[PDB]
Paper text:
Protein O-mannosyltransferases (PMTs) are conserved endoplasmic reticulum membrane-embedded enzymes responsible for the transfer of mannose from dolichol phosphate-mannose (Dol-P-Man) to serine/threonine-rich protein substrates or unfolded proteins. PMTs from three subfamilies form obligate dimers with different substrate specificities and require the concerted action of their transmembrane domains (TMDs) and a luminal MIR domain for catalysis. Here, we present structures, native mass spectrometry, and structure-based mutagenesis of the fungal Pmt4 homodimer. The core fold of the TMDs and MIR domain is conserved with the Pmt1-Pmt2 heterodimer, indicating a shared catalytic mechanism.
Structural analysis by single-particle cryo-electron microscopy (cryo-EM) confirmed ctPmt4 is a homodimer, allowing processing of the data with either no symmetry (C1) or two-fold rotational symmetry (C2) imposed. In contrast, the luminal MIR domains were arranged asymmetrically and only resolved in the C1 reconstruction at a resolution that precluded direct model building. Therefore, we purified the ctPmt4-MIR domain from Escherichia coli via a N-terminal hexa-histidine tag and solved the crystal structure at 1.2 Å resolution by molecular replacement. Our final composite model for the ctPmt4 homodimer was derived from rigid body fitting these high-resolution structures for the TMDs and MIR domain into the C1 reconstruction and directly building models for their connecting linkers into the remaining density. The luminal MIR domains of ctPmt4 adopt a strikingly different arrangement with respect to the TMDs, compared to within the scPmt1-Pmt2 heterodimer; whilst the scPmt1- and scPmt2-MIR domains are positioned to interact in trans with the TMDs of the opposing dimer subunit, the first ctPmt4-MIR domain is rotated by 30o relative to the membrane and consequently interacts in cis with the TMDs from the same dimer subunit. Interestingly, whilst the second ctPmt4-MIR domain is also positioned in cis, it is rotated a further 30o so that it no longer interacts with the TMDs, akin to the scPmt2-MIR domain. Therefore, despite major differences in the cis/trans nature of their interactions, the MIR domains of both the ctPmt4 homodimer and scPmt1-Pmt2 heterodimer have a similar asymmetric arrangement, whereby one MIR domain is attached to the TMDs and the other is detached from them. In the attached ctPmt4 TMD-MIR interface, the active site is completely covered by this δ site, whilst in the detached conformation, the MIR domain is rolled aside and the active site is fully accessible. Instead, the attached MIR domain directly contacts the TMDs via the β8−β9 loop, whereby exposed histidine and charged residues (E465, H466, K468) form a relatively weak interface with aromatic residues of the TMDs (F319, H561, W562).
Numbering used by the authors:
A (entry chain A), B (entry chain B): 49 to 694, 729 to 783
The structure:
């Protein structure tokens, strides 16, 4: 081909278009909560409802997710709870959440091309680096989910580009462009460290690159004049202000935004000292949830179908259509509307006693439920239900039965979701499962209506599995408790204000301490020595019916080539230094400086983003190598311009063929592992075997 | 005072005499097995009876201990078993065992003085370094026990001295003295790495010091002539042969000695492949080994407490003191004596069948255990045990329960320690854990007796953690198998011979793999960042009747001063380099070179023996810093010669006063903590409080 600015622009546009294509293609396919979408989606939602929470990560990533959610208009109440629940059946915009990391990944590929272009390399080198980042399965798989690692990688690449822009302005110090790019480098580093704490490693890179520069600026005998000590002091002050103080100010600003958005009580208030509880303005749910007492009359509403637990005088038919025999007891149903047949009085287990006031119902208490309209008592037993031969019938019985020979079958455990010992059962806020005490079945319902004999109402029966979310109920109203009762009018709510620095210091210390002790084990934790050559990969999500896995791993051909070129660059530097020690140059001035100033800089970044992971001994995963691998993709491109080099660039055909072959091979490797990256096409068992290269636990073999 | 060779010799003799005094004074006081004397004494004894065993450490240290034991003439059979048993009532020479590390510590102090003397420093600097090593409580406390860290420290100091001797001969290359000191440096490094694997760090130090030298030898433009490439090749070959190949040969020789001494079966044969069991003869000491068959009656003995698994008709009480409710089942206990209630019949899982002969029990088989004296079957279930709310109760049940509705809870897996698939379960030699099949709890016991209701016997319960060594049992006797039975006949007994390299490779791989997985938790594990300033110390041995503790920690004043001088040296080097960048020398040629060639070398050693502990993420203790701290004591001395410097050494009075004051203060600090180092004088409670400087867990307050 050829080389010109128009060709550079065409290649950049094509690379950006293909990046946006690959990152966004099939972004909504997993359509389910995946490996770590749980926590970050929870925190983004908590940002949206302004309820306070606690996390060990710096807030900026979750702020970005919450901004994306707020842009659409979603507020909702779908705080994520478990891996493997459908987003689409919950009216939540997960695609909007996932579009931000995809945008950042596409911009990461564009920024890689920009870094190679600005450094002065030829077109094939920029194309090779941008293509290695483009055709990488790990980068694609990380920018697909609700995960804040894509923001980290994008911020590191932006810091590299900003520092390359700034360093080229070293011949015009303290100008407007000079200060602008200094502050921009500081801001990129600030975003990098405000996403995840490992972003500190970028501060090492730009740190080292500054230090060497300062050393060059401190030489009393240097070709480009000499600086008096006050001038070097001005240079050092500028570097410290733009690279240390501004990043800290932006970090503090992000915590200021975090504190200002969160002004309501929520999960995570207890990690703070009581003064902070005094400033979170405990509100909104507080009003809606009142502790339920024995002898209260309540309504019980199914979370998913919105049906109310209901009864009426009609009885189950003697025979069902399949010939089974019922107890012919009073029907218990789910009813969508409000009427008196929804009213149940919650009563103690054990013998009859006259009513008492103020006895709170608590988590895991055994209770009876008396249907007010018929004066009967809820009961389950091992008689098969109307529609489910495996599930227990629910019915009601007389007082004499409930406190006599059938008493045990009238006892139900109130199991509060996420309940703790002694926790009070509250209207609205205590989602719960109602567990039949003899059998441990959970009271359950579903949408398909009963026949006409059951008034086309929902069936109520006993589910043998307790785990399903369809077993969850809530108490909507304490019907018997008047609107003016003291039990509803004792808020005692006052909210004070603390200085920002005090709150920030308390939160920072608590976050550091919890990150120092609150570690949850994961079966796919990796070690730094396994990353550069992809010895093992992590699995995020899988379902067995469609045979679809989303096993996360890099592109083996691309990673192996990048690491091998890292080794080749090490060898080239060693050989050049050894030949120089003998007094042989063997390198042109232009080709030496670049190999030590630009390419070396890239090799610095990789090192500064890889080696510090050996010092840290907590759990680390393969995605932690995503930043460093990025720098690995840069040196590769440089080394293709280097070894195949004859502005002198006549007959780049050698580098053109080199990059064409390497990128075609990496493209074949990316096509091979593409299903494992996306999980859309169900793959056969023998096809799973072909991907078992270096011992990858695909668990579909 | 003054300075002369006679004064140097007098100071050296006095320092050596005081070293031998301090290391040997009260060496036999603890007169009991202490923190890690167990393992190393076990291995030294096994060396003495020539019975094969397995360890993760290189053999040389235990060879030295066994040589010391053999010199006295002790062979005996007192293989150590538990921490806290008296040596004197067992006819064992523990003082002879402990004299070797004491000799090595005294020689370490002498070698420190020799290193400072040979490098060219003045008398006060050598005295200061040797006194800081002399008056150090950690070095004294490490050279007191049966522990192979003193050998490591002595070998590192010897390698430093040997390399300093060798480097001074650089002006007469390839001479007899040159080669002699090269080989001696290699041999010292070989001993260092053949004691403990962390001795590899010394190879880093002498490695780096060589590399710099080679760089200086590679310069084509250097003041002392120029070397052609063949001459530099000869130099590099000499370094590689004396520093890489000879150390490996000595390491291999120590394994050859280890293999030649061990030609009898012993504990640790099962870690090898059956060829190796074939190359070890079938020996007499603890000869017993007979495969256990279903329907045999056996006794089951706890390895650590020696209690027998036991039962009797008495039942658990309905309520424990804390209000918990038991199953009221038959008690299962640990009993120290021999009686028929220790007898259990081992039976198949699955349905009842009439007895069959010759069905061997194998690794990971599921079994039942029938208590012969009560005709009941061992059972565990998720009911909390007498003393441990977290651990499962062990009880027994009827035949009808064990082969009926409770059958699953009667099944236990026999998991042989280091077992392989299909391995036969044998009396005596198969140490095992008994894993409850439903819950995966391990059958466990501990020393604190049950109350009177349990006859003051040991509790048996289900430990949720399987890894602990306290889960290990063994079968002591096949009670049902008569003494004259064919199964007790001993077969073939033929011993083959393997090439040394094959045995070494198998043993090395197995040792590396077990060190990679076989880690036992310790409550006093420390982190590298706590070492240089003594933030926490380890306790070795203590008895409550005499109020004597042997809490192991360094000398706080000496360690703090040494680390502070390390920091001061860093600052001095930084300031000198910064002034040189401005073009200001500020240092004489002689005072510069020393500060970069001798003192810097010492600072190298410290670094190369401290920083590599951050890369390693296994358990580390304070004694691991003993080598590096040694180098810290050297730079200190150098920095006292440096800053107080006016052969020019007129009026050393400044350095004399400096070293006198520092050593007097360190001597006061060593006197303060001396009881905690020795444990001879019982100290009062208020005296224990005075030693609580930086949060030291003395547990006598
Ligand atoms: C185990 C050890 C191994 C294997 C490797 C160790 C790591 C290595 C080798 C190095 C570490 C990193 C190093 C050395 C530096 C990193 C930080 C530094 C110095 C810079 C940051 C990166 C960074 C933005 C570098 C900027 C480079 C830009 C593209 C230069 C622009 O063109 P420009 O006119 O200046 O070129 C030349 O400008 C000359 C002017 O004088 C002129 O004369 C020439 O004609 C020619 O015009
Ligand atoms: C964060 C970084 C910081 C803070 C610190 C970094 C670490 C530093 C500063 C350095 C790292 C270690 C370094 C540089 C070297 C270690 C290994 C080396 C080079 C040697 C091993 C140690 C080692 C046996 C050194 C031997 C030194 C012996 C005592 C020299 C004997 O006297 P000798 O005649 O040679 O002195 C002079 O000999 C000259 C001959 O030319 C002559 O001219 C002078 O008149 C004068 O007679
Ligand atoms: C004098 C200067 C000289 C010689 C030369 C000029 C050098 C120069 C101009 C620039 C660079 C300077 C250098 C080398 C460092 C400066 C950065 C620094 C130390 C502070 C600035 C960064 C900030 C704005 C905020 C830092 C947040 C704070 C408060 C603490 C974080 C704790 C971290 C980060 C703990 C990392 C482990 C982590 C727990 C793993 C979990 O990991 P994860 O959360 O991902 O799961
Ligand atoms: C080309 C050369 C150049 C450039 C310049 C010349 C350099 C020169 C002349 C000399 C030095 C060379 C250098 C830098 C290294 C050489 C050492 C080396 C790698 C091998 C030689 C050492 C040996 C004789 C035997 C080594 C035992 C073996 C086989 C493996 C051990 C594994 C280790 C040690 C695992 C360390 C962790 C440990 C598990 C923690 C537990 O700890 P612990 O057991 O205490 O509880």
């Amino acid at each position: 081909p050829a080389g010109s600015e128009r060709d550079y622009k065409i290649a950049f546009a094509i690379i950006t278009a293909l990046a946006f294509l690959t990152r966004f293609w099939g972004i909504s396919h997993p359509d389910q909560v995946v490996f770590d979408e749980v926590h970050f989606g929870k925190f983004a939602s908590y940002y949206l409802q302004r309820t306070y929470f606690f996390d060990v990560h710096p807030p900026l990533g979750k702020l970005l997710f919450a901004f994306m959610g707020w842009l659409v208009g979603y507020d909702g109440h779908f705080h994520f709870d478990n891996i493997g629940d459908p987003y689409v059946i919950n009216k939540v915009p997960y695609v909007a959440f996932r579009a931000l990391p995809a945008i950042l990944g596409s911009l990461t590929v564009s920024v890689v091309f920009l870094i190679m272009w600005e450094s002065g390399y030829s077109l094939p080198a920029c194309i090779l680096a941008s293509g290695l980042v483009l055709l990488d399965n790990a980068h694609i798989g990380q920018t697909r989910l609700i995960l804040l690692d894509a923001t980290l990688v994008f911020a590191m690449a932006c810091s590299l580009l900003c520092y390359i822009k700034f360093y080229k302005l070293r011949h015009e110090p303290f100008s407007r462009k000079w200060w602008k790019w200094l502050i921009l480098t500081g801001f990129a580093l600030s975003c990098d460290i405000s996403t995840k704490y490992v972003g500190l490693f970028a501060f090492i890179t730009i740190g080292s690159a500054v230090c060497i520069d300062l050393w060059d600026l401190l030489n009393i005998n240097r070709p480009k004049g000499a600086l008096t000590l006050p001038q070097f002091g001005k240079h050092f002050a500028a570097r410290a202000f733009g690279l240390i103080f501004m990043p800290f100010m932006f970090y503090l600003f992000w915590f200021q935004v975090h504190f200002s958005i969160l002004t309501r009580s929520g999960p995570g208030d207890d990690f703070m000292t009581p003064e902070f509880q005094e400033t979170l303005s405990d509100n909104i749910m507080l009003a809606n949830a009142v502790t339920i007492d024995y002898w209260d009359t309540i309504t019980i509403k199914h979370k998913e179908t919105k049906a109310y637990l209901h009864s009426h005088p009609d009885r189950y038919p003697l025979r069902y259509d399949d010939g089974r025999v019922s107890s012919q007891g009073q029907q218990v149903t789910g009813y969508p509307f409000n009427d008196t047949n929804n009213w149940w009085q919650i009563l103690p287990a054990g013998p009859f006693e006259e009513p008492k006031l103020g006895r709170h119902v608590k988590h895991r208490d055994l209770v009876r439920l008396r249907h007010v309209g018929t004066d009967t008592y809820l009961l389950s037993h091992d008689v098969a239900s109307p529609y489910y031969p495996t599930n227990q019938e629910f019915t009601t019985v007389s007082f004499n039965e409930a406190y006599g020979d059938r008493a045990a079958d009238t006892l139900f455990e109130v199991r509060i979701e996420h309940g703790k010992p002694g926790q009070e059962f509250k209207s609205i806020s205590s989602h719960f499962k109602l567990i039949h005490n003899p059998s441990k079945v959970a009271m359950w319902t579903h949408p398909t209506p009963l026949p006409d004999w059951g008034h086309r109402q929902q069936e109520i029966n006993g589910n043998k599995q307790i785990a399903p979310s369809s077993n969850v109920w809530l108490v909507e109203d304490i019907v018997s408790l008047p609107a003016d009762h003291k039990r509803r009018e004792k808020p005692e709510r006052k909210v004070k204000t603390l200085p920002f620095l005090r709150k920030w210091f308390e939160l920072q210390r608590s976050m550091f301490w919890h990150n120092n002790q609150l570690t949850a084990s994961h079966p796919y934790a990796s070690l730094p020595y396994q990353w550069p050559f992809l010895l093992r990969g992590v699995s995020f999500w899988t379902n067995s019916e469609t045979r679809q896995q989303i096993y996360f791993l890099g592109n083996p051909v691309g990673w192996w080539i990048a690491s091998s070129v890292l080794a080749i660059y090490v060898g080239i530097v060693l050989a050049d230094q050894f030949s120089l020690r003998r007094g042989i140059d063997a390198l042109d001035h232009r080709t030496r400086s670049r190999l030590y100033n630009s390419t070396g800089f890239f090799f610095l970044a990789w090192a500064t983003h890889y080696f510090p992971f050996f010092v840290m001994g907590r759990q680390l995963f393969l995605h932690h190598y995503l930043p460093a691998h990025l720098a690995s993709t840069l040196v590769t491109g440089a080394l293709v311009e280097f070894i195949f080099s004859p502005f002198a660039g006549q007959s780049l055909m050698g580098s053109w063929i080199a990059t064409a072959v390497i990128l075609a091979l990496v493209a074949w490797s990316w096509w091979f592992f593409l299903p494992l990256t996306y999980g859309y096409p169900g793959m056969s068992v023998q096809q799973v075997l072909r991907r078992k290269w270096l011992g990858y636990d695909l668990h579909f073999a």
